[PDB]
């Protein structure tokens, strides 16, 4: 109904405005922290190095910024367009996650990226649907074994279907939300909260890019980097199935 | 079909590896240059400032980089707000659309925590509205097409081709309204190149949302109605790209 969709627009609109109010309340007070820290770093340096003018240090910081903006990394191995990192980057496209912690610098890069995505995303969506059905099959099949127990306990077949869905997501959650967060906690030296933040920002395909795990491989733990890719793949499909059915429940409502 | 799933996986895999090869070919040389330039800057500074060890300059650069990475600006020493009501509205939009430009980061644990639940509830809610607008937008377009379709059928073009021609027009006009029109708009408004603008448009409507390009983010612009109004486009454009 057009009448109802206008209502829905207005609702969303309120969900946005309400969001805006909260984020502003929580974040505006710290808008400037990074500037403050940069300035502290400058002033601290000047006090330690009498042979440097503020203005000279200024130029250094501009020049550093330009190079970083071109993809330089502070050195004290780190190439974001080596084969492995470029592979990862391509993944971030077709998944639509788009962390963007590394930007394309060339017009050719951008141009190519357009066609790469138009063709890549739907291609990936297909595989994802496929893995979603196959993963859900495996899960629902395993849960079916536990369902056998409930039905013998004379719990109504309607509730058993519900309990299995709860189990369906709860076990997935455990494997694809909880397990990874604990993993990344230890591996990335993030806090639990940072890790869950990352996980969920990732599996929703929001992909802010303030946190990123698997862009580069880790010596002394080879299985890490692939397992992360494997994880994103499996996790996305699990998340997708949840959204389609919760989307499924919602539209009829 | 288990056979096909495995084939598809291998295909994708090849699509990635092929992507990787290309991006590396197109980007690495530029990156390796930047890395060189950073080092040239260091070595130049050392030669001009004997009171500074290489290792000390190293820490400075790391610390500067971290702050810039947090969105500090090299130019000034310290008015406009990235979390004013309009930009916060925009930011929320970037979540539920799953676009996630991320050119402004949440700094607080509360911000992050809230953001999690805001999205879990917000994205499906938005998906619903999007389906709704998708059907309604296509309906209105299809109705408008019908009147011009009457002309083709009288011109004795087969009804099968008239359906094809209309689809061409259907997408071409949508494309015109949601791809071409915006790109030309942003070209002039953001001082981007045509290629930058299309890049932005598409990165956006695909919901990739890199965040290298963001309309209205520019600090200098006196453009309050601009940034939410662009979201009006984003809404309509997304529902139409869903097709």
């Amino acid at each position, epitope marked *: 109904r057009s009448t109802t969709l206008l209502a829905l627009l207005a609702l969303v609109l309120l969900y946005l405005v309400s969001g805006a109010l909260v984020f502003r309340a929580l974040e505006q007070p710290h808008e400037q922290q990074a500037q403050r820290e940069l300035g502290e770093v400058r002033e601290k340096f000047l006090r330690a190095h009498p*042979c440097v003018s503020d203005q000279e240090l200024g130029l250094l910081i501009k020049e550093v910024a330009d190079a970083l903006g071109g993809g330089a990394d502070p050195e004290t191995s780190h190439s974001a367009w080596d084969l492995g990192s470029a592979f990862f980057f391509s993944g971030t496209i077709i998944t639509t996650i788009g962390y963007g912690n590394v930007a394309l610098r060339t017009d050719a890069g951008r141009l190519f990226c357009i066609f790469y995505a138009l063709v890549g995303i739907p291609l990936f969506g297909i595989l994802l649907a496929g893995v979603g059905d196959r993963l859900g099959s495996s899960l629902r099949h395993g849960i079916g074994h536990i369902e056998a127990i409930f039905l013998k306990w004379h719990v109504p077949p309607e509730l058993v279907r519900v309990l299995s869905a709860m189990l369906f997501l709860l076990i997935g959650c455990l494997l694809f939300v909880l397990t990874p967060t604990f993993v990344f906690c230890y591996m990335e030296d993030w806090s639990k909260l940072e890790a869950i933040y990352f996980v969920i920002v990732t599996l929703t395909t929001v992909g802010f890019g303030d946190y990123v795990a698997g862009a580069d491989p880790r010596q002394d733990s080879p299985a890490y980097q692939p397992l992360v890719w494997f994880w994103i793949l499996l996790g996305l499909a699990y998340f997708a199935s949840v959204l389609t059915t919760i989307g499924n429940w919602l539209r009829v409502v | 079909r288990s056979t096909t799933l495995l084939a598809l996986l291998a295909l994708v895999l090849l699509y990635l590896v092929s992507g990787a090869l290309v991006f590396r070919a197109l980007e690495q040389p530029h990156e390796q240059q930047a890395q060189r330039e950073l*080092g040239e800057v260091r*070595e130049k500074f050392l030669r001009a400032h*004997p*009171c*500074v*060890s*290489d290792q000390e300059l190293g820490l400075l650069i790391k610390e500067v980089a971290d702050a810039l990475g947090g969105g500090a600006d090299p130019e000034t020493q310290s008015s406009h707000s990235a979390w004013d009501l309009g930009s916060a509205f925009f930011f929320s939009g970037t979540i539920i659309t799953t676009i996630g430009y991320g050119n402004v980061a949440l700094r607080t644990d509360a911000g992050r925590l809230f953001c999690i639940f805001y999205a879990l509830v917000g994205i499906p809610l938005f998906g619903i509205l999007l389906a709704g607008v998708g059907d309604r937008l296509g309906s209105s377009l299809r109705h408008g097409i019908g009147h011009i379709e009457a002309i083709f059928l009288k011109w004795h073009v087969p009804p099968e081709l008239v359906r094809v021609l209309s689809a061409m027009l259907f997408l071409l006009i949508g494309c015109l309204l949601f791809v071409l029109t915006p790109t030309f708009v942003f070209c002039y408004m953001e001082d981007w190149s045509k290629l930058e603008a299309i890049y932005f448009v598409i990165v956006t409507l695909t919901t990739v949302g890199f965040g290298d390009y963001v309309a209205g983010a520019d600090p200098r612009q006196d453009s309050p109605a601009y940034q939410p109004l662009v979201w009006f486009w984003i809404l309509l454009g997304l529902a139409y790209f869903a097709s």
Partner: antibody
Amino acid sequence: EVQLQQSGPELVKPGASMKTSCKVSGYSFTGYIMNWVKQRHGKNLEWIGLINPNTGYTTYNQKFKGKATLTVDKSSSTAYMELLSLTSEDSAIYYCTRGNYVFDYWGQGTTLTVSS
Amino acid sequence: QIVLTQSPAIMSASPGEKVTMTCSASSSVSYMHWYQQKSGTSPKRWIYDTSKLASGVPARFSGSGSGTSYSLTISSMEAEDAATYYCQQWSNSPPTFGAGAKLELKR
């Protein structure tokens, strides 16, 4: 005429430690980075580490991490190196030298002899 | 831990001969420096930033190179040129030296 004047040769027992010095004159001590370099009888030169006399900052060659401690005395514009738990492997000539990219002025060196 | 290789480690020249010693780097380097050492005494900065001459140094000495390969040259050998020459780099901490090239007089 810049000059780095090192202290004389030193002779110490295995296990003991030892401190040696480098006084600068002809320029301002705190304006430049000081390094130390090891040369074991007439062979490759080894950078031990550096100190920034103005800031007290030190970094070391990983080889020498636990072995060597650099310090300065600003007032007497003098740089010090301490070497720990000496073995015969440490017997060498040690230089103080100035620089943050090239080593442009060197002390005359000091010879350390570790022996019973 | 950039590695500098001077090879050969020993060489000998008659007076009047042109001499060239080389320094190759394990990975690229923006400047090379050279020291001259005569037995008994500390090294002397001889050439720095690849091709700049230190104060004492006569013109017959020159330096060149780039990236991963650098060289020190004597246009015409003299007696007082007999010494060991070392290359060194500080394009990456930690700074490092070649193992030196000993130059004796031929006779």
